[PDB]
Amino acid sequence: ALEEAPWPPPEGAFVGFVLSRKEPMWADLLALAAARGGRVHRAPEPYKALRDLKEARGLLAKDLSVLALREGLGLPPGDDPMLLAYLLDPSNTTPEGVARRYGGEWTEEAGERAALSERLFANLWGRLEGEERLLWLYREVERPLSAVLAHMEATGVRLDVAYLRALSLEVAEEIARLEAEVFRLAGHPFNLNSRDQLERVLFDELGLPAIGKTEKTGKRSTSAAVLEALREAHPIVEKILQYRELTKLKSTYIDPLPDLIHPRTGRLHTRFNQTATATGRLSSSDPNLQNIPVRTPLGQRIRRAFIAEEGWLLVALDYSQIELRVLAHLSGDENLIRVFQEGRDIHTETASWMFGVPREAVDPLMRRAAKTINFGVLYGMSAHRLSQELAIPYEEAQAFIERYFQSFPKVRAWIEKTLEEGRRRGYVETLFGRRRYVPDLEARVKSVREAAERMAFNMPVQGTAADLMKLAMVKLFPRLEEMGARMLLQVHDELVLEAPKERAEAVARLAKEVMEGVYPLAVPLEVEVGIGEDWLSAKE
DNA sequence: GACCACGGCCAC
DNA sequence: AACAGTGGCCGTGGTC
Ligand SMILES: O=c1[nH]c(=O)n([C@H]2C[C@H](O)[C@@H](COP(=O)(O)OP(=O)(O)OP(=O)(O)O)O2)cc1-c1cc2ccccc2o1
Ligand SMILES: [Mg+2]
Ligand SMILES: [Mg+2]
Ligand SMILES: [Mg+2]
Numbered sequence: 001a002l003e004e005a006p007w008p009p010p011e012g013a014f015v016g017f018v019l020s021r022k023e024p025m026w027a028d029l030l031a032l033a034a035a036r037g038g039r040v041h042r043a044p045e046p047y048k049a050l051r052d053l054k055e056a057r058g059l060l061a062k063d064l065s066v067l068a069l070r071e072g073l074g075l076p077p078g079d080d081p082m083l084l085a086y087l088l089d090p091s092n093t094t095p096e097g098v099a100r101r102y103g104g105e106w107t108e109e110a111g112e113r114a115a116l117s118e119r120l121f122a123n124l125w126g127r128l129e130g131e132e133r134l135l136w137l138y139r140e141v142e143r144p145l146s147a148v149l150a151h152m153e154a155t156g157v158r159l160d161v162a163y164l165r166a167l168s169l170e171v172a173e174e175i176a177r178l179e180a181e182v183f184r185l186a187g188h189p190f191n192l193n194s195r196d197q198l199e200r201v202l203f204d205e206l207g208l209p210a211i212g213k214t215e216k217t218g219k220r221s222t223s224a225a226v227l228e229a230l231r232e233a234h235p236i237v238e239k240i241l242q243y244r245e246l247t248k249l250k251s252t253y254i255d256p257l258p259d260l261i262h263p264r265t266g267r268l269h270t271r272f273n274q275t276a277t278a279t280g281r282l283s284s285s286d287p288n289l290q291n292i293p294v295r296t297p298l299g300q301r302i303r304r305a306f307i308a309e310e311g312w313l314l315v316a317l318d319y320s321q322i323e324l325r326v327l328a329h330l331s332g333d334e335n336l337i338r339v340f341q342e343g344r345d346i347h348t349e350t351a352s353w354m355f356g357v358p359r360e361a362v363d364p365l366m367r368r369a370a371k372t373i374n375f376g377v378l379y380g381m382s383a384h385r386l387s388q389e390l391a392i393p394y395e396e397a398q399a400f401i402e403r404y405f406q407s408f409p410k411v412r413a414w415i416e417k418t419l420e421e422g423r424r425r426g427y428v429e430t431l432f433g434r435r436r437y438v439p440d441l442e443a444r445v446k447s448v449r450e451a452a453e454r455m456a457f458n459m460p461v462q463g464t465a466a467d468l469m470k471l472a473m474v475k476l477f478p479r480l481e482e483m484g485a486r487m488l489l490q491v492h493d494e495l496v497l498e499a500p501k502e503r504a505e506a507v508a509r510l511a512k513e514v515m516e517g518v519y520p521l522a523v524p525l526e527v528e529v530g531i532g533e534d535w536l537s538a539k540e
Numbered sequence: 541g542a543c544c545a546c547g548g549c550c551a552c
Numbered sequence: 553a554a555c556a557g558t559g560g561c562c563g564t565g566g567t568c
Contacts, residue, residue, distance in 0.1 A: 191563095194563085195547060195548075196564080196565085211553065214546080214553085215553095219547085221547080221548090222547085223547075223548060223549085244548085245549095248549065249550080253550085285559095287561080290550095291550045291561085292551075293551080294551075295550085371552095378556070379555095380557080381554085381556045383555095385553085385555080388554080446555095454555070454556060455558095457557095458557045459558095462558065491552060
């Protein structure tokens with residue numbers, strides 16, 4: 001940890017390493033070091049020294065394991081003090097912040113990162129002695145999960161590049177037509193992408209009324225909620241919303257994604273961040289593949305670009321009404337449990353209410369609208385906003401929210417119990433004991449307290465569902481290798497797999513069973529599954 | 541070139 | 553916009 005011994009290190013040492021850049025699939029490995037006892041080992045040539053390691057044990061283990069897979073080396077991740085910190089407090093999200101909480105410094109030298117990994121592991125493992133529930137989540141979920149994510153990251157997903165490039169041009173021509181239509185209505189040209197320029201045109205030059213203001217700077221907002229509020233008080237607004245949709249999808253997905261294909265795989269490689277969220281969810285970045293478009297007809301065209309290798313099929317599995325089922329288990333609502341022990345669909349039921357139509361005539365776009373509504377209401381939405389999203393008088397929306405919860409009395413009782421317990425203990429917890437600390441529950445400004453309250457009772461629900469999915473991933477991944485299949489993506493309550501066409505149907509059937517039986521609840525988990533040549537087909 | 545705050549908006 | 557929650561990436565506008 002200050003003293004130096006010749007490479008290689010002894011078995012079980014802690015590793016540090018420096019990458020030329022944050023993405024492991026794209027990084028040059030600039031330095032590799034390892035630490036054990038009172039000694040640090042430094043490698044003369046980093047790529048060769050990788051061959052010597054049996055596992056990756058230390059800070060950001062998964063990242064080094066991914067780079068090793070890229071080179072054809074099986075170097076699974078083992079212990080990672082970031083995972084210990086994240087289980088102790090999920091505000092622990094980066095090495096910089098962990099080190100300056102638990103007794104070190106994160107620099108840019110591999111040998112220091114290795115010596116830091118050594119101490120940070122000893123400190124945090126000691127803080128976890130006696131937290132049997134957190135130790136369980138570390139050994140049975142997070143640590144084995146890191147290996148699953150490393151393989152997902154190194155495998156990647158195939159993308160139809162020539163398609164997206166052709167699509168970029170069709171979208172550009174439609175963007176330019178819309179720009180010209182707005183310029184004409186404004187009587188002049190300007191930067192439609194400049195929020196501040198648009199504000200002035202809409203609210204000063206034209207007379208349009210300003211419905212709301214931005215948070216930090218108090219400017220007149222031009223957000224969709226504001227604009228759609230007057231989608232007919234001027235047609236220009238209508239075109240602006242269509243321009244925004246198109247430019248958003250072009251600059252975020254259509255244009256950048258094609259330029260991210262890796263030269264040695266032919267595929268697109270995301271990163272699955274395991275200590276990035278306050279609830280236990282994963283996140284995805286560089287690029288985010290958890291927010292690929294899907295809701296609009298153009299977003300659908302984009303999602304179709306995600307395709308199976310030649311000779312394989314994509315398999316898509318998605319839990320049914322997942323947080324609603326979890327809520328049933330957590331709250332013990334007899335009436336809510338029943339709903340699911342009878343195969344009812346509350347998303348479909350709210351849509352039938354919303355659109356005045358029998359359950360037989362709800363289509364997939366209707367039910368999507370009802371999902372946002374049902375979860376909006378659930379987690380604390382206000383009567384006022386609902387009346388505005390649903391386009392109905394204030395008093396009509398007040399009432400749905402009343403009936404929504406009368407249905408299931410035990411829910412509000414579980415909310416209040418969770419908060420009281422969170423006020424007493426400092427934190428709220430998932431079914432498996434994952435914690436989120438929420439101090440503001442006893443803040444003296446109502447607005448701050450009530451926000452903390454909404455964050456606080458959402459966490460056990462969203463975080464239990466994430467625990468279940470993570471555990472499902474951990475159980476499923478060994479069965480996929482034995483069938484010659486691959487795990488490609490996770491989108492919170494959804495998995496995408498890639499399987500040989502000859503094994504696709506068996507793989508689907510199997511993955512569904514594992515997901516549904518991951519951890520029986522007081523309510524059955526149902527999983528929808530589809531198979532197709534592309535990401536969209538598989539979700540149908 | 542690198543970093544940042546902000547408004548805004550995609551997904552779950 | 554807002555008494556829904558959880559993320560990450562865009563362009564703009566700005567500094568060093
Ligand atoms: O606005 C939201 N707020 C929120 O907190 N979530 C959470 C809660 C859900 O259980 C979980 C998984 O989401 P999801 O798989 O899409 O939905 P569900 O599992 O409940 O239902 P199903 O699979 O169709 O049967 O994500 C989702 C949405 C939402 C709204 C929407 C509209 C379109 C497409 C997806 C959507 O997602
Ligand atoms: Mg679902
Ligand atoms: Mg889903
Ligand atoms: Mg730069």
